[PDB]
Amino acid sequence: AFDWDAYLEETGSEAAPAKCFKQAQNPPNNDFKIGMKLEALDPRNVTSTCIATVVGVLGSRLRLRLDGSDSQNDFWRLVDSTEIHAIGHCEKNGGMLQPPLGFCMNASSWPGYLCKILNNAMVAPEEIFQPEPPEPEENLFKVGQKLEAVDKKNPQLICCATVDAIKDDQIHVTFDGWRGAFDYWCNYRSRDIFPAGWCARSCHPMQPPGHK
């Protein structure tokens, strides 16, 4: 557990208040199990809803892999993400499940494939998907404030970070102790940022500053 209070005192810094974040006040319970299938937007084509399997769980997050794709493009979503739903959600809403961009077979093999993977599949029940947290009405972050942020280049990691700059609804996230290469702009509504102390509360590892 990272000592945020000692860290904020020594850097003469404030953590961004919880009201800045589109995150729940308390980290949502994660009742997903490895092997459970669900529906997720394909990160490599966000127009597509695809079948994903939980291949890992960490705190309130799921490590997801699209069935029929590859093991090199796994992605992480919170259990209260609006980009994941129970199987059947897409159809109920007038849509059609799609092959993943990285589908390992040819496209005419898709309809048969879906039948095969869904047959006696372990499926995440709709009740374990958590409600979408309220969002702030505006960007309330201020330059200099610290927070916990996903390293988008190594998304298993959530790390000590600082708001470097602000432009309207976008905040600039920089990772304490790391070269500016891991920096990124995101919307203040990002699900990839958390108030200080959130990881410890959710049982997710939280990376201390880098040694540079």
Ligand SMILES: CN(C)CCCC[C@H](N)C(=O)O
């Ligand atoms: C924590 N995060 C901001 C940086 C992670 C970088 C790890 C990588 N293997 C490296 O050593 O470059």
